[PDB]
Amino acid sequence: QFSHNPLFCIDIIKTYKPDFTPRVAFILGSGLGALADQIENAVAISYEKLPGFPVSTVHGHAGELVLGHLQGVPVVCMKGRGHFYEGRGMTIMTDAIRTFKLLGCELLFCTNAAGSLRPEVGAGSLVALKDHINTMPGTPMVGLNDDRFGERFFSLANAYDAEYRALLQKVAKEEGFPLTEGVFVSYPGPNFETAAEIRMMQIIGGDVVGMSVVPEVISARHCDLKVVAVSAITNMAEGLSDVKLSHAQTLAAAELSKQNFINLICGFLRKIA
Amino acid sequence: QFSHNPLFCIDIIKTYKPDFTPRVAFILGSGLGALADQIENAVAISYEKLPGFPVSTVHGHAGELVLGHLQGVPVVCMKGRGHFYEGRGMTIMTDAIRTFKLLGCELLFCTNAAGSLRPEVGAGSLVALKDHINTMPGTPMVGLNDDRFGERFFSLANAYDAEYRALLQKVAKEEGFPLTEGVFVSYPGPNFETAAEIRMMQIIGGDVVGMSVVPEVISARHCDLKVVAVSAITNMAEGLSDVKLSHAQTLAAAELSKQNFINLICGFLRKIA
Amino acid sequence: QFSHNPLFCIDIIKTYKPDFTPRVAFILGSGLGALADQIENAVAISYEKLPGFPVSTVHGHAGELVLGHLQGVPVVCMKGRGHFYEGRGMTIMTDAIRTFKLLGCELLFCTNAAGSLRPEVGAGSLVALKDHINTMPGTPMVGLNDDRFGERFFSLANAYDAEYRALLQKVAKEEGFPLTEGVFVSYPGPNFETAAEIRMMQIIGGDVVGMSVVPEVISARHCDLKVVAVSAITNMAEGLSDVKLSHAQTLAAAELSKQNFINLICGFLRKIA
Amino acid sequence: QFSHNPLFCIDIIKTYKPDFTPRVAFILGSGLGALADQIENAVAISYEKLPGFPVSTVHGHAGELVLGHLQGVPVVCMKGRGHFYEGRGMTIMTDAIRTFKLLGCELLFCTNAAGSLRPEVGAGSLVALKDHINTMPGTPMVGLNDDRFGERFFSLANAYDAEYRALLQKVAKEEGFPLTEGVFVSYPGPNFETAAEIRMMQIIGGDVVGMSVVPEVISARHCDLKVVAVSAITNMAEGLSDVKLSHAQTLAAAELSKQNFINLICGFLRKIA
Amino acid sequence: QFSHNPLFCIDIIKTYKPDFTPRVAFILGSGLGALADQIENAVAISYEKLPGFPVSTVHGHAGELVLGHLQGVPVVCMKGRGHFYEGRGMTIMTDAIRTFKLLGCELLFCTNAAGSLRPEVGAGSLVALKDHINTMPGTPMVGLNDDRFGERFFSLANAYDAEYRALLQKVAKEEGFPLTEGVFVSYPGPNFETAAEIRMMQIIGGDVVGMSVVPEVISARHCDLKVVAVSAITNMAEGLSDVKLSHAQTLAAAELSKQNFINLICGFLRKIA
Amino acid sequence: QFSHNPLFCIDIIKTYKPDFTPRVAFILGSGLGALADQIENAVAISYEKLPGFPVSTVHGHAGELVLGHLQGVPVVCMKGRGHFYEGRGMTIMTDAIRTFKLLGCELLFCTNAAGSLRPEVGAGSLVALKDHINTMPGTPMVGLNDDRFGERFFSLANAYDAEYRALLQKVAKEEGFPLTEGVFVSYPGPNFETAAEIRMMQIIGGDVVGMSVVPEVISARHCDLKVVAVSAITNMAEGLSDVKLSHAQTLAAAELSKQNFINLICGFLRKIA
């Protein structure tokens, strides 16, 4: 018995956004949705109307799916995501990603607020993730495989499309701001990491730590949906500074890089258009 | 739907220990309960009478909650804890810690028998943990958050109160025995670690390995209950010696440090009184 | 309430293979079953007839249990195993191993196709595992303990019998092919590892990475069944080469070492006979 | 947590049948769907596309929802229903009925093949049910009440609208065929009734026995949706004749009254138009 | 695994009502709690504080347990009950009754608003039930038996104590009002009965119909707690009159007999004192 | 997903009773197993060894399956049955009956201790049931149908084979004792019926009341296994006498008819041999 939500959604969306085929799908984490406000002919569907979507329970995540145009590019934007720490398993974002795939999207632009594991990169920086290290228990596709979307086994090689990443770099040069690339390691949460664990993440070879990304991305790769991810650093990981960690700190510190983020995105979109 | 056990307990305890407000809550692991025998006006409530408490299934853990005085300090002492390996999830110790919090406790003194990851520290030593590395799958607060006790997100910074740890040090000098501080990393169990995994724990940066602590502590921090933890080393981790590992070895080797432990605790209590 | 499948099987097997007591139990992973074809007076029982056994859902795994003789040695051979990624928990192979134990087996010869974490060892090589690092969430015995088969706590010291491993070495010299020994680290799957994660496995101290072994082995040790494992390398781990990873690549690349494997096994059996 | 399927469907249907508001909703049981073939501008939606709908598992039930016009009357017709004996509880038809309600329907015309408990009425007869006796265990609304659709408690007085029943009578006179009215008693099934039980149904005061109706009707009344039901007798109840009972007998014997049924319906519709 | 709520409650109650042993336990249904207002030295415990108790969801049921004295008789009074139609099974009232038993109660005085099945007895009448006919699916003790409270099998002979019923009669003569005795048959609800079903209840031999009583009483008999029940008729069953059925009608019509009820109870208590 | 226990058992039984095909299957209720003691070459298999069988929890039911010969007739005899009141649903006896069917049995001889609903028939009498009235909630086949054993819908006409019943009559004449035939109505239990309910059973048209039979028989008919049932009356139903009901009374009163029962059975077997 496999979920059929992705299919339902496709029909439900057609009722609100008829004759529309998006190219890029976006996931806007905490306080990053200020982008969805600039979508042309934007139509908003609440997750409550889309079976399978992550009905929000966290701040900085609304619970809407915005469809429209950005830089003359058809786009499906997710204001708010779903996390592992919500207690619904690594599959929380899957049907959602699977919807993007059916909608016709050709790429997933995954954004998220994170912490830095490199003293060199501080709060307010943007990082284009180039690979990840899962620390959450298990993976999204564990269980019976849904032949409809993907295969039993799949490679995560070049998960974070190297080619699209290259365009991200150009866009960054052009806009006068650094775009460092790093390995993202996922933490289950909902509590923050311990200083001890952060050092362990540094030793393991990580550059950025967050509580999401992984679920979505692995699901995306499984159904063969190209991925691109950019984290908005909001502080140094626990123990690398003197700053106290709070969700309030996260939401606030995501405003320093907000402008560069929108330029990076709107720039990327313009080159791919 | 959130558990209400903590609340039930508070009433249940009032029937056995009326007009009593404890300051320090204790968790006595395997063969460490010999301390609860010196509690003044000690009242004992079986876990079977306290909804949510870890009804024992392991040796060295009775299943009682002792309330009374120690060094003229009101105290609630847990003879026996609950583990992940019992198969009930990372939430096994939560309602319990949450009870301590409601009872009015101002600090959790968590004890546990562990293995050493440093050849320098051997069997019979006591270690004041200063941080930890979770290796168990997931965390205690994963799932809907209980606004009543804590917030969705919380910092583990200074989880093992640095100030209380300092007092622990004085007490140790005063009693003529070393109190080394180390990072505790948790293992799921119930099988012991592999030599290979132990080396991995050394590389990750750990000093002590055990099958508990983490669940309790993270729950404690969530509901804002200061923590203090001391492990009683009972052997070197797998592969760092010639000694064979067994639960029988654990219970037995926890008798070498038993006296120093009681002195350390009874000393700590006297300074905080 | 404990599973009784192991017991049922013993009776069910007696109906197909009467008055037969195997000494060595074998687990043949993907495309490794070509060995079971040389079993003398071979009797085949489908897993569908054996309660608890892993009814296959993966390629390279049939779903049969072959009983007979090999080098004049009574043998119970499992064509096809069960994995964590199937979504049934770390206990998926337990009843099976527990059956071997009851059958009277004196040792488990576990085989499996894996990836190499050492550039020195490449595709087509055989590796005798000498220990492992679990990365899957949790362990097989987590939960109530079945006193019938083992104890609550058990040591994984010398899990991969060092003495049997020594015989494996002789057999390898004698047959003119290398038999390197390494630490096997398990990955949950079903997706393959990320380059980033592989490096992390190298740092953690691993030599071979695969999606099985661990479950079986830990279960084996719990009920006190000596273990021996040999992985057939089918490629370098993700990111250590230019080769693309697929299940098709795995099945195909397990044919280069197939002959040496059979000779190693048939040789081992002859020395223990 | 209440089901939201009814809502989803409304959107899903809008995609296939835009700007359409049905007045009468129909439920076509076994071999009664031959009516849905005469629907003007008929649009067909498979239950597989409508969350909550009874995806068929029984013969004589397709799994489609047909929308269109009949006698110039907007109509939503259910080809195939869901039963208790399927093992999903008395709530199996609820979301479906609740969908009719939201769609805007003003009445439910429930049809079903049944057995007669009166020797006077035989195979091929049509019966307009005037009340029912539930024999299935429990009722559809047992559980938390969904304030959205109805109240905690509701009256089943005049469940089978007496006024609409009167029109049914006229239509019957006009078409030259009897339309006897009777009490329908529900049996759980899936096995047929015992002669003994049938006599018990006669004693209890029943006129027609079937394995459905009840669930739908009670759900209908709860969300305040007027009901009308007509059973197509396909044989005498067990023990009142010499005929053997089978599903094959049911499907076949529903062809004797098929023409009168269509005339009765198409006639009813014309008077209400 | 058996529920331990009854035991917890006993301790929880001791905290609010110390050194108190009730003789009669009362269950006050809809709008019948006006009695609990005359309890001497009344102490009120919310069901939210008593594990196992039916936290209300229905009107006319508060969610409190009142303990005190009535006619100088120690009494434990339940303001509000739990029903089957709530969706929690026939066991919904058990732990509650089991609590009464442990508390030391010697009898259960069960009250409830019902419908009359006899035209002779109308709205406002009181009926002392003398036996019952269960129509709800299953029974409270179905499942593993709790040796602590009762036996696997138990007789319902003289369930409604014939001797106590006799005292009820005297009290009724003495107060100048009739107290007819009748058989109570239970209906699952939450919808009201159909006229058809009511006739069926008359044929089956019932005198009063309601949606409760049965669960409580059978539970009581199981743990050997003498029972006494009195229904307050609030209308004729469906189809025996012209009155419309609603919960509003029930609550309102329970005020005509309210005074006689209190006199009957307060009178009964005085004779047993 | 359908149960495969029946199949497992067939193999498990072959190990204990090789080359044996039974003709009659027997179900011995409470204190009726004294028959299984006269089975020739009797082999006994504990239910603990037969997956799906009702591991006993009730007195008068051992938990064994005896296979052998009786009157030179191959026979599979069930010492002890499973009931609804055990809390495992109406399917509790199914796999068992389904095993009889596969074993090759040509008929089920169902016995059980019951109560009489006719004053004419008293304690110690034997009754050949000729039909039944189910009062338990639901039926055994409710749910997905197992095409392997039966069809979705099946007739209960002549459930209690009329022809075999005729032989039962002869055997009874021949042995000088009455064999009255009656309709058996099932009660859920585990509590006994109320006087009120018994009268209701008389009105409904029943002659014997018990807590079993129904589940087994309906399952038998579904997989097309001819049925024969005989109840051993152990008392009058509640309220038709002065005798108190207890399980102790049941076991004891089943000794008056024990001899006639064995003669009736051993006689029946001889005529069918």
Ligand SMILES: O=c1[nH]c(=O)c2nc[nH]c2[nH]1
């Ligand atoms: O896992 C995380 N750790 C952090 O420190 C952080 N900061 C923002 N977002 C974060 N996520």
Ligand SMILES: O=c1[nH]c(=O)c2nc[nH]c2[nH]1
């Ligand atoms: O996880 C653990 N590993 C050990 O080696 C040990 N010794 C005591 N307690 C221990 N816990």
Ligand SMILES: O=c1[nH]c(=O)c2nc[nH]c2[nH]1
């Ligand atoms: O986890 C795994 N990773 C790999 O790269 C591989 N190759 C074969 N088998 C494998 N298992």
Ligand SMILES: O=c1[nH]c(=O)c2nc[nH]c2[nH]1
């Ligand atoms: O419950 C039922 N009993 C019958 O005899 C019958 N015939 C058709 N449909 C039927 N349903």
Ligand SMILES: O=c1[nH]c(=O)c2nc[nH]c2[nH]1
């Ligand atoms: O089942 C019930 N039916 C009724 O008609 C009624 N009136 C009050 N209470 C009632 N309960």
Ligand SMILES: O=c1[nH]c(=O)c2nc[nH]c2[nH]1
């Ligand atoms: O349901 C039952 N009721 C009885 O009175 C009885 N006596 C024996 N067996 C019985 N079963």
